[PDB]
Structures are given as structure tokens and as C-alpha cells.
Design a protein around this ligand. Structure first.
Ligand SMILES: CSC[C@H]1O[C@@H](n2cnc3c(N)ncnc32)[C@H](O)[C@@H]1O
Ligand SMILES: CSC[C@H]1O[C@@H](n2cnc3c(N)ncnc32)[C@H](O)[C@@H]1O
Ligand SMILES: [Cl-]
Ligand SMILES: [Cl-]
Ligand SMILES: [Cl-]
Ligand SMILES: [Cl-]
Ligand SMILES: [Cl-]
Lengths: 260, 260
């Protein structure tokens, strides 16, 4: 009924999911935290195993929906957790099958295109901003991991309900072309202030990665290049901050505000 | 001169500066990174010792301005550095004697008031945005360390480029009153959208910390409470993201934009 040893074969296997290689091998991933488990369930992900720590609430067990439930000791729980302070509720979920083929957009979508691999921390924060501003689609680089403990924790589970898709650059470009999305490249030296863009119709914002920045080919194909002004001698802002600024400017305009 | 061994007593002394207690004891702090050293120098901070790694460039030596110059070996640099990949330019600066009493504001200041201690490394991010948006003053919590390797790195040196003062709540409240500054409280349930505030005149934005939010008395005292809309399931954004959105909304209005 209650797994006590951190050396239990079941506990070692659960702790193994901390590695992306193991998640890919098993086709499963661990969602740590009551709120994140709630979000995965509500997003429709399939719960395989519910994990309950010594201080779990009675309601937590009722989340199982017929999945296997495991009670863990503090020691066993600490082994499985990626937190300094382990959550009392965790769930092992099945990796989902999703693609862009199932995406349908309206006449004026709000789209974010994240090019390159971002520093850890940035994707989760971007996803939080996209959730807040109500982006209709987020494209990320192929091979970006949407199921790491890091992105689950840093997005506070926002990753699960958001329309976010890792896609190869060529297919991303074709998808945007096929849906006739105006591309707006965000770059520190862009010729237009970002407030002067018109985001009341469909827009796809293009953002580069913290180091290399936006690839020259993407900058050129965009119809507009916009900058966020920097009044100090700082070069650039963090990419997640930039994403939030762009998304909420679009929301301002869509809420009745005029472009500058 | 050249310092080769990690065991050289100067290297141990330089490495000791990683601790706040030692910075306080010596009246000195280390600034790592060419950009960060540039900002510290441009802020008028006193450079006592310039540190150059094996791959420093000729212009770096000319930053010294009469300060002692030490050429560190790779291994000596590794011990002094707080980074995985050490910077090639670092500087030991004198801790400045600053008081909020010496601050003078103009007719239309943009002020940020950060109440309570924040998570690492929210402050650094906030200061990057404040630098970018042209904030005139940032008030932070009483115990806050503005000279840690962490805040220097996370702010990319913006902590030097802005007036930032750690103050108790009472001192912040007195300062704001005596400058007769309109207080705008940012809170997820604020009665107005943040775009609806008028920030074309002097304004101080109030932001609370993650775990608490704003003290009720501060919220009540504010001229207006404003929300950033959240269109998804998440209730709140990260405090640093919120600060950037507020600051750049103020800049938008000061750049010709109208309140929504
Ligand atoms: C080099 S930082 C990574 C990306 O963030 C975006 N970014 C950072 N700062 C700004 C800025 N001031 N204006 C527009 N985009 C920015 C750009 O898309 C960049 O490629
Ligand atoms: C980090 S979440 C808590 C703090 O960030 C600010 N904050 C976070 N989200 C919002 C929001 N949607 N609207 C206004 N302020 C917010 C508020 O000032 C709060 O004190
Ligand atoms: Cl609850
Ligand atoms: Cl992340
Ligand atoms: Cl243009
Ligand atoms: Cl340079
Ligand atoms: Cl910080």
C-alpha cells in the first residue's frame, strides 16, 4: 500500500523520468505539483500513475480516475521530486500525439514563432505570457522539449493547454505562408517601433534566441521588423520579456487601442 | 602583474568577495563581465583593481584608469569567477555611500516601488526592464543586496545604471508622499486595465512579491489599482514580467500613445 524505500525498483524507475532519454524510452513523463497535475488532467492528458506523499489531501486520491495510486514516504518522495521542497501530489502521464494538421485558425490569429533553442527558464516564462495574452498558436524549434520538469514547473502547467508545437523551420515557414499570416520580426534594431505595428488583423511575431538572435533569412522574409526601445545602453531584453511585451501590445490594440 | 596559481593569497581574497559578509567587511565588491564593468565605470563607481583573463583584448587594459591591473591565468580566473564560463574582464570596485535623501526627481518621474523581498532572480530582470523603459527610480525592500554577483549578472549591469534604493516600507511611503506622487497599485484584480491609467505625468507603480502580493493598506492608499488581463487559466504573471509591461505602457504613453 505504501512504498517506503527510495531503493524500491518502482521508485528508481520514477526518479529515472528526470532524464529526457528515459521519458522518450518509456513514453511517459512526470508531472510534479498539485496545480500542474490539475492542469494536465484538465488539458486531457492520460494519467497512468498518481503519486501521493505523506501530506497529501484526501481529495488528491480522487484525482486518479482509475489510474494506479502509489503512496510514498518522505524519503521515497524526495528521490522522485525535482524540487528542493517535494510536492505531495505527482502524476505520471502519457506523452501525447499532436501535430499542426489539427490546428484551425480564424481570420485574425495571434501567433508567436520562437526560433532557435532558448536558455532554460525562458520557454516556461514565454508560455506563461502566451497563456496570459491569449496567443492562438506558439511555434517552437523542432526537438524542443515541452515535457521536462523545468518547462512544466516554469510554465506552472500552462504548457499543457497552450497550442504549442515544435516544428522544423521549413515547415513552420510553409505553415505561416499557407495561412497567409503577416510576419513581424522582433529585433533590437528593427526599423519600426513595436507600437507602430498594426496587430488587429492576423500577426505572427518572430523572435530569435538569446544568443545568436534572429536568423537573417527570417528577418528578410518578414514584412515588418519592429524594435522595443531600449533607453539605457543595454543591447537587448530577455526573450520572454520581449514576447510578453509584443503579445500584450497586440492585446491592447485588439481591446480598442490604436497603433502609435 | 600576473597571478598564476589558484592558491595565490590574492586569488583567495578575490574569491572571498563572493560572500556578502566579506563585501561588507572590505567595502569592496567584484564586477564580472566586460559589459558589467563598463556600466559600473560609466556609473562613476571607483575601480580599485582590474582583472584580466588570458583572452582579454588590448582595450580592456585601458579601462584601468590608474587602478592596479592583475593578469590571471585560466585556473586563477576560474576560482575568482562566479560563472561556469568565466568572463575575461572583471573589476573590484569600492562599495558606494548612497542615500535616498540625495535623490532629486523631475516634473514627470517614472517610479517603480517593489514591496517585499522577491524570488531570485526577479530583481535583475526588473532592473533590465527599468533601464530599458527609462525608469527614474526603483525602490526595493530594506534588506536587498544590490551588489551581489547574482543581481549584477542578472541585470547585465543595469543595477549600476539606475537609481535603485533598498528602503523600509515607511521610508518608501514617506518618500512618495513628500514628492506627492500618484500611486498606481498593480494587482490581478485591479478595477482598471493597466492601459487605462494615465502615466503621462509623475507616477509610481506598486508591485508586490510572488508569495504575498501588495499589503492591503498600500492597495487602498493607491490612486488607482490596475490589472494586466489574463485570458487563460493562470491567475498571475511573474512580478518581473508585470514590471516590464507596466513600465513600457508608461513609455508608450510618454511616446505619444493615449490611455485606452
Ligand atoms: C538577442 S535577444 C533574443 C531575441 O529577443 C528579441 N529581442 C530582445 N530584445 C529586443 C528588443 N529591444 N526589440 C525587439 N526584439 C528584441 C529578439 O527577437 C531577439 O532575437
Ligand atoms: C508575481 S505575482 C504577484 C505580483 O505581481 C504583480 N502581478 C502579477 N500578475 C499581475 C496581473 N495580471 N495584473 C497586475 N499585477 C500583476 C502584482 O503586483 C503582484 O503583487
Ligand atoms: Cl485547491
Ligand atoms: Cl523553462
Ligand atoms: Cl516600417
Ligand atoms: Cl565593445
Ligand atoms: Cl537577481
Amino acid at each position: 500500500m505504501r512504498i517506503e524505500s527510495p531503493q524500491n525498483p518502482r521508485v528508481k524507475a520514477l526518479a529515472a523520468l528526470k532524464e529526457r532519454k528515459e521519458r522518450e524510452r518509456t513514453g511517459r513523463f512526470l508531472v510534479e505539483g498539485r496545480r500542474e497535475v490539475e492542469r494536465a488532467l484538465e488539458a486531457g492528458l492520460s494519467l497512468e500513475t498518481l503519486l501521493l506523499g505523506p501530506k497529501a489531501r484526501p481529495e488528491d486520491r480522487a484525482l486518479a480516475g482509475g489510474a494506479e495510486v502509489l503512496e510514498l514516504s518522505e524519503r521515497a518522495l524526495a528521490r522522485v521530486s525535482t524540487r528542493e521542497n517535494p510536492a505531495q501530489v505527482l502524476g505520471v502521464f502519457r506523452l501525447p500525439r499532436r501535430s499542426l494538421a489539427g490546428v484551425t485558425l480564424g481570420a485574425a490569429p495571434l501567433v508567436l514563432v520562437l526560433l532557435g533553442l532558448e536558455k532554460p527558464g525562458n520557454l516556461g516564462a514565454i508560455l506563461r505570457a502566451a497563456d496570459g495574452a491569449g496567443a492562438d498558436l506558439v511555434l517552437v524549434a523542432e526537438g524542443v522539449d515541452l515535457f521536462s520538469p523545468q518547462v512544466i514547473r516554469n510554465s506552472t502547467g500552462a504548457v499543457f493547454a497552450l497550442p504549442v508545437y515544435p516544428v522544423a523551420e521549413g515547415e513552420a515557414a510553409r505553415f505561416l505562408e499557407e495561412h497567409n499570416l503577416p510576419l513581424v520580426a522582433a529585433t533590437p534594431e528593427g526599423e519600426r517601433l513595436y507600437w507602430e505595428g498594426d496587430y488587429r488583423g492576423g500577426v505572427a511575431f518572430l523572435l530569435g534566441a538569446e544568443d545568436k538572435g534572429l536568423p537573417e533569412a527570417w528577418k528578410r522574409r518578414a514584412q515588418v521588423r519592429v524594435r522595443i526601445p531600449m533607453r539605457g545602453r543595454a543591447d537587448s531584453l530577455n526573450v520572454a520579456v520581449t514576447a510578453a511585451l509584443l503579445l500584450y501590445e497586440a492585446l491592447r490594440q485588439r481591446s480598442g487601442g490604436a497603433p502609435l
